[PDB]
Amino acid sequence: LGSMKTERWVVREHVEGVPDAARIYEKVETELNTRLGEEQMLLKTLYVSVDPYLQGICLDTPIGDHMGADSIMQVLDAGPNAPFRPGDLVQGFGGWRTHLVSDGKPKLWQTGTFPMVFPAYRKLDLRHYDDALPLSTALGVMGGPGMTAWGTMTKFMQVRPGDTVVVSGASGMIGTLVGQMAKRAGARVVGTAGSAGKARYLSQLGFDAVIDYKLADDADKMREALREAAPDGVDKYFDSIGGSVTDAVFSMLNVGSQVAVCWQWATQVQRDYHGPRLLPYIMFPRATIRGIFSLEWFTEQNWSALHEELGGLVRRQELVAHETVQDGFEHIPAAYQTLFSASESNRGKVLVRV
Amino acid sequence: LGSMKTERWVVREHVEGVPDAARIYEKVETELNTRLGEEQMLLKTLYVSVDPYLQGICLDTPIGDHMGADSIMQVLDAGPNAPFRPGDLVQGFGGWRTHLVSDGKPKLWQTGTFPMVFPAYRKLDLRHYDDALPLSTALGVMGGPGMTAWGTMTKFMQVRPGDTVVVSGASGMIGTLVGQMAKRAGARVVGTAGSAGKARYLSQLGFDAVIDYKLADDADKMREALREAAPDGVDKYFDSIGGSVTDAVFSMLNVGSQVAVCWQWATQVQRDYHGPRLLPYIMFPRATIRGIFSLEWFTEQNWSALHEELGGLVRRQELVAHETVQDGFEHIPAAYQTLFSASESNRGKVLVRV
Ligand SMILES: NC(=O)c1ccc[n+]([C@@H]2O[C@H](COP(=O)([O-])OP(=O)(O)OC[C@H]3O[C@@H](n4cnc5c(N)ncnc54)[C@H](OP(=O)(O)O)[C@@H]3O)[C@@H](O)[C@H]2O)c1
Ligand SMILES: NC(=O)c1ccc[n+]([C@@H]2O[C@H](COP(=O)([O-])OP(=O)(O)OC[C@H]3O[C@@H](n4cnc5c(N)ncnc54)[C@H](OP(=O)(O)O)[C@@H]3O)[C@@H](O)[C@H]2O)c1
């Protein structure tokens, strides 16, 4: 019954470390077969998300295949048993593609270091979004990133007023969201930034102390900045970076503390594969480290709560949830490259509109 | 008015690594003032414990002072407000000494890496003991070690039937305790031994698989031995060893897994301070690692419970809890040295009768 011309960003080359987007990615035109299966449905991408964790998926993506990504899609056309009818807005791992055909079921990430099943698509009810909480928040504070932050702070971390909370890679959306909730629950918040621009930005949001991780290239010099910024010890660590800062924070864990390992920038991107053993430090404090893989929380009730609980605070200016929306499908890898650029140009989540 | 001659083992020299007990320790004669205060007590040591963690306390024990140690002591004489009357059996950190004076109160370990409060002495009620669970069990299955194992299995680890539980340093008393409770909870249990003597000992008691960590000083054959022993992945890791075995186990953590870090022989004893970054492996499996410091559990309700839950199983021959009782105060470091001996002639908990 027909086909259609579509643009895709495919994985051209595997490069370790801080990526070179123009070298890694290639826009191709690709003929998309439009004869939908029993439960398949033809989707139009409206927004794609650009995220640092994609640095890993790219290395596990077969050369020539399209680049995965959280996206917002519209149902152009749907097969007889599809989960959504034409017109429905949906969220899922659509990728850097203009159009795609999918049955919307949980697919498995076969070529992955860890076998992973991507979540089945979720429908968006447009009634939830307006100019203070736009639809693009479904890829940020009302989607993947917000669910990560909200999930950790309500289902794992119990922040007592007086606790000192350290957030690494704080300047991004998950770290700023986490820290602000910690400020709200009565915590001293310590964050980490890479420039003065981000450092004063995190200050506004209410971070009591911000450490320049680039100035503290050393793990000892990072341990001193940490000793003074958190004079009474760390009670909660929300870790996105790893490397020498987690080595530093783990040397100062209070009793009963809780670490949340969310990502490890320092090992994925900058390849800090060997370092001091951190496990000895957790024995006396009875510290609980927990890995975060927020997909587990992608359920209907959770999405409901995330809107009511968190969404209110965002629209009432009680919680800042910034976003930087470039425009144009052609500029997606450009937009992605900014995540590794030292410029102070990012606030919150980065999205592309198509 | 009153004094008493008492022998004490004092710390002559600090030596790092596998200890040289004959070189580190020294039997001295010590005149003990027996004129007790109104709430003090003169105590006689009946049994002393030798434990691999003493290697750490010995290095933090100021030169010339007595070597700390868990002991079982009897009240020779007590002031009018003492917490215990004469004849009473108590358990506490009496040390490698024949006689001592104490208020039985929580002493603080100033000279420690982490400020640590030694627990106040606990009274031993002889009704609790019999010919299958003798008085010496208060330093083993009915004391510190048993509280560690039972504490972790009842207050942290939830072993579901089918899980594969890996216990490192299994041949000792905490490790054998932990494995048998996982075996009883429906787990395939994997342990680690250094000789066929230890491994076949672990074979009896019910370990489905035993790994020769000495054959695999390298992590490559260690990750292979684990792949074979745990073909379906690790769900529960009870870690006493650390080092390249924990490196191997972290590469095969299933979803929802739980590590319990209890000690790190390879870092304390063998100085394995550096290794592969393990926190990256805990993200996707949503693993919860937790540090163990069983002092937190030394409360009366817990002690009642340890006798009820654990003590019953031992008395009903459902749980083997072996112990190796050296005799003679003169031999305390001799008995201590066997813990670090490359020969594996010791089974269960090691005590001296004095
Ligand atoms: N586990 C999950 O389910 C899950 C879900 C979504 C995302 N994630 C991952 O978790 C991370 C947290 O999200 P996010 O929004 O907070 O991302 P993010 O802040 O953009 O993460 C990178 C930030 O960390 C800082 N940084 C970069 N390199 C660094 C280094 N070498 N040392 C110290 N700090 C460095 C940078 O701060 P400056 O701006 O100051 O340079 C940068 O803004 C993301 O990277 C994402 O990939 C995990
Ligand atoms: N966190 C706490 O509060 C707490 C409380 C009490 C005790 N602990 C610690 O927990 C440990 C376990 O208690 P336990 O009484 O059952 O002691 P343990 O098992 O005797 O501890 C060491 C055991 O591991 C094995 N081992 C020795 N060297 C090894 C190596 N290089 N690699 C791998 N395995 C090795 C030994 O068996 P082989 O004969 O096979 O060498 C030995 O039986 C103790 O060592 C103690 O220090 C912690």
Note down, in words, how this protein is organized.
2 copies of one chain form a homodimer. With 354 residues, chain A is an alpha/beta fold. Chain A contains 10 helices and 18 strands. The longest helix of chain A is centred in the last third of the chain and has 16 residues, at 300-315. In chain A, 25% of the residues lie in helices and 27% in strands. In chain A, helix 3 (144-155) packs parallel to helix 4. Chain A has helices spanning 21-24, 54-60, 144-155, 173-184, 196-205, 219-229, 243-250, 265-268, 300-315, 332-337; strands at residues 3-11, 25-33, 41-50, 71-78, 89-92, 99-102, 108-109, 116-117, 122-124, 164-167, 188-193, 209-212, 234-239, 253-261, 274-276, 288-291, 323-327, 349-353. In chain A, strands 3, 4, 5, 6, 9, 17 and 18 form a 7-stranded mixed β-sheet that branches. Chain A has 2 domains: 3-126 and 325-353, Medium-chain alcohol dehydrogenases, catalytic domain (Quinone Oxidoreductase, Chain A, domain 1, Alpha-Beta Complex), CATH 3.90.180.10; 144-294, Rossmann fold (3-Layer(aba) Sandwich), CATH 3.40.50.720. Chain A starts with a strand and ends with a strand. The A-B interface holds A 114, 116, 239, 242, 246, 261-264, 267-268, 272-280, 282-293, 296 and B 113-114, 116, 239, 242, 246, 261-264, 267-268, 272-280, 282-293, 296. The complex binds NADP nicotinamide-adenine-dinucleotide phosphate (NAP) (2 copies). Chains A, B: Residues 17-352 form the Enoyl reductase (ER) domain. Chains A, B: GO terms for molecular function: oxidoreductase activity, acting on the CH-CH group of donors, NAD or NADP as acceptor. Chains A, B: NADP(+) binds at residues 53, 171-175, 194, 198, 213, 262, 270, 292, 294, 343. Chains A, B: It comes from Lysobacter enzymogenes. Chains A, B: Pfam families: ADH_N_2, ADH_zinc_N.
